[PDB]
Amino acid sequence: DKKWLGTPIEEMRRMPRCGIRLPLLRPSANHTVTIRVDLLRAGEVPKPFPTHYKDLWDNKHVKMPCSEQNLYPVEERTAGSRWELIQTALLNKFTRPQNLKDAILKYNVAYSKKWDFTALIDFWDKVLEEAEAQHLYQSILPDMVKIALCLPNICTQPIPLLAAAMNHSITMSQEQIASLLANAFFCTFPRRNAKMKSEYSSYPDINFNRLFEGRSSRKPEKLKTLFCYFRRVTAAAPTGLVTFTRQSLEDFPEWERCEKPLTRLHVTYEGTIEENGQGMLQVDFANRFVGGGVTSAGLVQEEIRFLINPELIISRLFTEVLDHNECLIITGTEQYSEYTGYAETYRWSRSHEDGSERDDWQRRCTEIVAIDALHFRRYLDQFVPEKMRRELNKAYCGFLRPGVSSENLSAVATGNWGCGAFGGDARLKALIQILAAAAAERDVVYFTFGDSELMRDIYSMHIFLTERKLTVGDVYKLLLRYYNEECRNCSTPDIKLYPFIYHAVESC
Ligand SMILES: Cc1ncc(Cn2c(=O)c3cc(S(=O)(=O)NC4(C)CC4)ccc3n(CC3CC3)c2=O)s1
């Protein structure tokens, strides 16, 4: 009973080994760089560029909590500095969870009856042992406040929003990320709270207040994972960089006419994308709002990655909701925790010491792409040509690196994308990803997460199409025939996709 099938994993392209020498890092129209590139050195904390805080309070940039324009009404007409109120509120000793709740609410007065702190109170009072709670309020929380309040000295450059249709990159230091994330913990980002807000209505939540609500047994696990990160980065400043790239394609292939052959496949029911997919493009089965319910209740594939690699969470500050033709590529995030389980069985296990090498820009050699699958009301909706074409184009966009040659592209480490709650058919999604990877000229490493039968079926299908030398176009036309013969006229399907494919090819 083989645990993997196909091309051996050692034969698949990894990184930075099979990842081209980087050009000089520099800001440009499509690339924001928030650190001194001339001073970038291995093992040294990057220096912010510019030296002194420069503020932009407008529609194209993150509205910073430390901004002079971040004001609150006081009474007559006297507008007060919200930043000064944040400083005053957070520079108090917290001995009990109520003190933390009270501090947060001082600069979020409008949410005093709307924000529930039950999970935070229960974590501190009912989950943590006496010594763990003491360490939290005597050392972790004061160290989080200091780095949150250091924000104007750390993030001196305005952060542009990665808005819809923009092809833009942001490179920032892990230290800048820690200061920003300690702010999101203290719920200091302005204009990101109202349910009826229009300005940021198409942006994910960034303030962590939903992580403090309710009684889910999973909240202490999310909190343990995040405090593990905060304890690590406040004790010793991380020295690397992280790049966030929004990619939007205009020109999509005419799939039915794609003459490209299929690429190699490694398929396994054992292993994980983060451990066994090192040096490979790692897929995040994202929500259109990147990170999904990470700052609230979600605990599936995406949320877990965002908890163990917390630097991914800051994409929520500046990443607008993904359109059908967009993806977010994140390079350099570091893994700080290890975990067990998934969803309702998820547990934080221990601290992780990330062994990844850094590239020439001091970024950990870890590339994660966020690609959001569709949510299908009815099962058969996914076989609609427009819905199949959408999934192909989404995966293709996440996998394509325009300009880069095929021999310099690592394999894609992916799995059961859009399954469970979203209603995706694993056999169809596996084919869709195999076709998009072929069009993008990358090999596929596929994880079926315990489903041994799915591993065997994907392998048998792949070997069948490969041996018959069917192109991407040939396979896409078989998907169009399936819809037509079995799904279009279907009122209740009679025949499953893979049997249909074997029959259609073998009888032709
Ligand atoms: C047959 C199925 N298809 C989807 C399913 C959901 N699912 C996953 O998607 C899953 C993803 C990863 S991972 O490699 O993507 N790593 C993460 C979580 C991102 C940090 C790891 C574990 C997963 N487990 C639990 C395990 C099978 C027992 C799971 O149950 S189970």
Secondary structure string (H, E, C) spanning 183-252: HHHCCCCCCCCCCCCCCCCCCCCCCCHHHHCCCCCCHHHHHHHHHHHHHHHHHCCCCCEEEEEEEECCCC
- Distance of alpha carbon 296 from alpha carbon 187, whole angstroms: 13
Q: What are phi and psi of 329, to 5 degrees?
A: -110, 125
- Distance of alpha carbon 51 from alpha carbon 154, whole angstroms: 9
Neighbouring-strand partners of residue 364:
358
Tokens of 81: 């500095």
Question: In this structure, which residue's CA is closest to atom 2 in ligand 1?
Answer: 449
Handedness of CA 300, 305, 307, 312 (dihedral sign): negative
Question: In this structure, which residue's CA is closest to atom 27 in ligand 1?
Answer: 449
- Distance of alpha carbon 91 from alpha carbon 106, whole angstroms: 12
**Resolution of the PDB structure in angstroms:** 2.2
- Distance of alpha carbon 303 from alpha carbon 286, whole angstroms: 9
309 belongs to an annotated ligand binding site: no
Closest CA to 171 of 336, 329, 398: 329
Nearest ligand 1 atom to the CA of 301 is: 18
Neighbouring-strand partners of residue 72:
80
- Distance of alpha carbon 411 from alpha carbon 414, whole angstroms: 10
Neighbours of 356 (CB within 10 A): 18
Catalytic residue numbers read 284, 302-303
User: 174 near 241, Cβ under 8 Å?
Assistant: yes
CA angle 183, 213, 283 (to 5 degrees): 65
Closest CA to 305 of 278, 267, 339, 328: 339
Distance 301 CA to ligand 1 centre (A): 6
Distance 347 CA to ligand 1 centre (A): 14
449 φψ region: left (φ > 0), alpha (ψ -120 to 50), beta (else)? left
Q: How was this model experimentally determined?
A: X-ray
- Distance of alpha carbon 316 from alpha carbon 27, whole angstroms: 22
User: 221 near 347, Cβ under 8 Å?
Assistant: yes
485 belongs to an annotated ligand binding site: no
CB of residue 429 inside a 6 A radius of ligand 1: no
Distance 480 CA to ligand 1 centre (A): 30
Distance 135 CA to ligand 1 centre (A): 33
**DSSP string of 323-351?**
PTTEEEEEE-----EEEE--GGG-EEEEE
Cα 366 off chain centre by: 12
Question: In this structure, which residue's CA is closest to atom 3 in ligand 1?
Answer: 416
Closest CA to 252 of 435, 484, 465: 435
Question: In this structure, which residue's CA is closest to atom 25 in ligand 1?
Answer: 342
Tokens of 459: 């392998």
